[PDB]
Design an enzyme around this catalytic site. Structure first.
Site, PDB file in Angstrom:
ATOM      1  N   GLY A 162      39.286   0.964  -2.481  1.00 45.99           N
ATOM      2  CA  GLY A 162      40.371   0.397  -3.303  1.00 45.99           C
ATOM      3  C   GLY A 162      40.195  -1.026  -3.854  1.00 45.99           C
ATOM      4  O   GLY A 162      39.330  -1.290  -4.711  1.00 45.99           O
ATOM      5  N   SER A 163      41.048  -1.927  -3.369  1.00 43.67           N
ATOM      6  CA  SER A 163      41.129  -3.326  -3.809  1.00 43.67           C
ATOM      7  C   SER A 163      41.280  -4.193  -2.571  1.00 43.67           C
ATOM      8  O   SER A 163      41.778  -3.724  -1.549  1.00 43.67           O
ATOM      9  CB  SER A 163      42.328  -3.541  -4.734  1.00 43.67           C
ATOM     10  OG  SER A 163      43.492  -2.906  -4.227  1.00 43.67           O
TER      11      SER A 163
ATOM     12  N   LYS B  43      42.018  -4.886   2.767  1.00 45.87           N
ATOM     13  CA  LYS B  43      41.696  -3.867   1.786  1.00 45.87           C
ATOM     14  C   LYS B  43      42.816  -2.834   1.735  1.00 45.87           C
ATOM     15  O   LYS B  43      43.123  -2.195   2.747  1.00 45.87           O
ATOM     16  CB  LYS B  43      40.372  -3.196   2.102  1.00 45.87           C
ATOM     17  CG  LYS B  43      39.956  -2.190   0.988  1.00 45.87           C
ATOM     18  CD  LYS B  43      38.608  -1.555   1.211  1.00 45.87           C
ATOM     19  CE  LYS B  43      38.390  -0.507   0.109  1.00 45.87           C
ATOM     20  NZ  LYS B  43      37.073   0.203   0.189  1.00 45.87           N
TER      21      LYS B  43
ATOM     22  N   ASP C  45      29.766  -0.473   5.125  1.00 42.06           N
ATOM     23  CA  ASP C  45      29.569   0.578   4.135  1.00 42.06           C
ATOM     24  C   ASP C  45      30.666   0.303   3.088  1.00 42.06           C
ATOM     25  O   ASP C  45      31.814   0.599   3.303  1.00 42.06           O
ATOM     26  CB  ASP C  45      29.691   1.994   4.766  1.00 42.06           C
ATOM     27  CG  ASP C  45      28.948   3.120   3.957  1.00 42.06           C
ATOM     28  OD1 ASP C  45      28.841   4.264   4.447  1.00 42.06           O
ATOM     29  OD2 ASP C  45      28.464   2.897   2.845  1.00 42.06           O
TER      30      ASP C  45
HETATM   31  C1  1BU Z   1      34.161   4.290   2.644  1.00 39.87           C
HETATM   32  C2  1BU Z   1      33.797   4.601   4.087  1.00 39.87           C
HETATM   33  C3  1BU Z   1      34.113   5.842   4.639  1.00 39.87           C
HETATM   34  C4  1BU Z   1      33.767   6.108   5.966  1.00 39.87           C
HETATM   35  C5  1BU Z   1      33.135   5.115   6.733  1.00 39.87           C
HETATM   36  C6  1BU Z   1      32.810   3.879   6.175  1.00 39.87           C
HETATM   37  N1  1BU Z   1      32.200   2.981   6.942  1.00 39.87           N
HETATM   38  N2  1BU Z   1      31.242   3.263   7.693  1.00 39.87           N
HETATM   39  C7  1BU Z   1      30.846   2.180   8.354  1.00 39.87           C
HETATM   40  C8  1BU Z   1      29.691   2.170   9.416  1.00 39.87           C
HETATM   41  C9  1BU Z   1      28.867   3.466   9.454  1.00 39.87           C
HETATM   42  C10 1BU Z   1      28.757   0.953   9.198  1.00 39.87           C
HETATM   43  C11 1BU Z   1      30.404   2.093  10.769  1.00 39.87           C
HETATM   44  C12 1BU Z   1      31.631   1.148   7.969  1.00 39.87           C
HETATM   45  C13 1BU Z   1      32.500   1.676   7.057  1.00 39.87           C
HETATM   46  N3  1BU Z   1      33.486   1.049   6.374  1.00 39.87           N
HETATM   47  C14 1BU Z   1      33.454  -0.235   5.908  1.00 39.87           C
HETATM   48  O1  1BU Z   1      32.507  -1.012   6.112  1.00 39.87           O
HETATM   49  N4  1BU Z   1      34.559  -0.660   5.288  1.00 39.87           N
HETATM   50  C15 1BU Z   1      34.808  -1.823   4.660  1.00 39.87           C
HETATM   51  C16 1BU Z   1      33.777  -2.479   3.991  1.00 39.87           C
HETATM   52  C17 1BU Z   1      34.004  -3.640   3.239  1.00 39.87           C
HETATM   53  C18 1BU Z   1      35.287  -4.191   3.114  1.00 39.87           C
HETATM   54  N5  1BU Z   1      35.508  -5.312   2.328  1.00 39.87           N
HETATM   55  C19 1BU Z   1      35.291  -6.617   2.592  1.00 39.87           C
HETATM   56  N6  1BU Z   1      35.228  -7.068   3.858  1.00 39.87           N
HETATM   57  C20 1BU Z   1      35.005  -8.356   4.127  1.00 39.87           C
HETATM   58  N7  1BU Z   1      34.873  -9.264   3.171  1.00 39.87           N
HETATM   59  C21 1BU Z   1      34.935  -8.893   1.869  1.00 39.87           C
HETATM   60  C22 1BU Z   1      34.789  -9.860   0.861  1.00 39.87           C
HETATM   61  C23 1BU Z   1      34.854  -9.477  -0.482  1.00 39.87           C
HETATM   62  C24 1BU Z   1      35.067  -8.145  -0.835  1.00 39.87           C
HETATM   63  N8  1BU Z   1      35.119  -7.811  -2.140  1.00 39.87           N
HETATM   64  C25 1BU Z   1      35.215  -7.169   0.173  1.00 39.87           C
HETATM   65  C26 1BU Z   1      35.151  -7.554   1.532  1.00 39.87           C
HETATM   66  C27 1BU Z   1      36.328  -3.514   3.750  1.00 39.87           C
HETATM   67  C28 1BU Z   1      36.105  -2.334   4.508  1.00 39.87           C
HETATM   68  C29 1BU Z   1      33.146   3.620   4.845  1.00 39.87           C
END
Ligand code: 1BU
Ligand code: BOG
Length: 337
Positions: free
Chosen positions: A30-31, A47, A162
């Site tokens: 999403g956002s 998020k 991810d």
């Molecule tokens: C889509 C999906 C579905 C099922 C599993 C995942 N996974 N899987 C993992 C593993 C296998 C490594 C355990 C992790 C995730 N999900 C994940 O990492 N989610 C996530 C990632 C990034 C963010 N965002 C930000 N966070 C921290 N600072 C920012 C700064 C700027 C910005 N633009 C975004 C962010 C929020 C949630 C992901």
């Protein structure tokens, strides 16, 4: 125990969040908003998932991500600080918000903005492998490792995430060939491709597509030997491999000119076509290259994770109710001190 929520529109999007989270500011889509967490002091990313229950694929994805993130408790893997919905009942449940530590840079930034020393590569690849050991021990395969999925702070501390530059560039050759199943060492392939790029500043295998990606890979590692051909179940893959004009395995020392020879040796151990022969994350951590970080008393494994749950065939409303239960049962992490 419900906290007090406050509403705000941010870029034509509603945002209803606990008072706990202050000074929301959009950071892209999403956002996600950067926020101040008044409870902890920390800067956070909040998020708001996009249409989490739009369809069975979305609802399942929502459930899986929430469950996984609730499970991850390791220094080199993203953790959940909080999850909330403004709904006070399942019947009004439509929005899910995830809260994590705010990230500055990713490894795509550090690589494309620096020339990395061998010392700095050692430390970053070490941490990647240490988080992978943990993830892999839960019987989870990342499948999408690439620089942008690796957050790195000003202390060079790294976390695997991810976000959900082509992914195919870092993908193991068996996923190119649409292999039926694959091993956890698909992720070791990716780390090898990432490590290569950190050492040279160049994409190792910048394939324009999937056949091209195989071509570039085989150029470095060579075409399959008769031991590997014997392991191809697919009649069509087998024929295509036997159809190839044989290419020899390159010597990585003649390719990675100027690199540390222990780094080269490790690359040779990661970028093996036969996945059964690829070094594992736990084995990699004990490679001489990481002599100065490796601590077998501080490379923990995860509790078991039941993947069967996210893979059932359920109605939208059932995934919805299950996700709600995971939100409600969330237990926050302990604060530092
Ligand atoms: C889509 C999906 C579905 C099922 C599993 C995942 N996974 N899987 C993992 C593993 C296998 C490594 C355990 C992790 C995730 N999900 C994940 O990492 N989610 C996530 C990632 C990034 C963010 N965002 C930000 N966070 C921290 N600072 C920012 C700064 C700027 C910005 N633009 C975004 C962010 C929020 C949630 C992901
Ligand atoms: C022409 C390039 C295609 C080469 C693909 C072979 C690399 C994969 O290696 C294969 O991975 C499988 C999946 O886990 C295993 O079951 C096999 O034992 C292993 O050899």
């Amino acid at each position: 125990e419900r906290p007090t929520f406050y509403r705000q529109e941010l870029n034509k999007t509603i945002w209803e969040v606990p008072e706990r989270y202050q000074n929301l500011s959009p950071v892209g889509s999403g956002s996600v908003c950067a926020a101040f967490d008044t409870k902890t002091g920390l800067r956070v990313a909040v998020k708001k998932l996009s249409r989490p229950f739009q369809s069975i694929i979305h609802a399942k994805r929502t459930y899986r991500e929430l469950r996984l993130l609730k499970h991850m408790k390791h220094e080199n893997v993203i953790g959940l600080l909080d999850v909330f919905t403004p709904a006070r009942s399942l019947e009004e449940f439509n929005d899910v918000y995830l809260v994590t530590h705010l990230m500055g840079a990713d490894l795509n930034n550090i690589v494309k903005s620096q020339k990395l020393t061998d010392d700095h590569v050692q430390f970053l690849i070490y941490q990647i492998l240490r988080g992978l050991k943990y993830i892999h021990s839960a019987d989870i395969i990342h499948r999408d490792l690439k620089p942008s999925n690796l957050a790195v702070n000003e202390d060079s501390e790294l976390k695997i995430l991810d976000f959900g530059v082509a992914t195919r560039w870092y993908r193991a050759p068996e996923i190119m060939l649409n292999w039926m199943h694959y091993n956890q060492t698909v992720d070791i392939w990716s780390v090898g491709c990432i490590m290569a790029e950190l050492l040279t500043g160049r994409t190792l295998f910048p394939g324009t597509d999937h056949i091209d990606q195989l071509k570039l890979i085989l150029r470095l590692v060579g075409t399959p030997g008769a031991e590997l051909l014997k392991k191809i179940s697919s009649e069509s893959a087998r024929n295509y491999i036997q159809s190839l004009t044989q290419m020899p395995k390159m010597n990585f020392a003649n390719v990675f000119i100027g690199a540390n020879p222990l780094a080269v040796d490790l690359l040779e151990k990661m970028l093996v076509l036969d996945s059964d022969k690829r070094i594992t994350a736990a084995q990699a951590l004990a490679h001489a290259y990481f002599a100065q970080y490796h601590d077998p008393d501080d490379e923990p494994v995860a509790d078991p994770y039941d993947q069967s749950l996210e893979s059932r065939d359920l109605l939208i409303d059932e995934w919805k109710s299950l996700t709600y239960d995971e939100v409600i049962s969330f237990v926050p992490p302990p604060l530092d001190q």
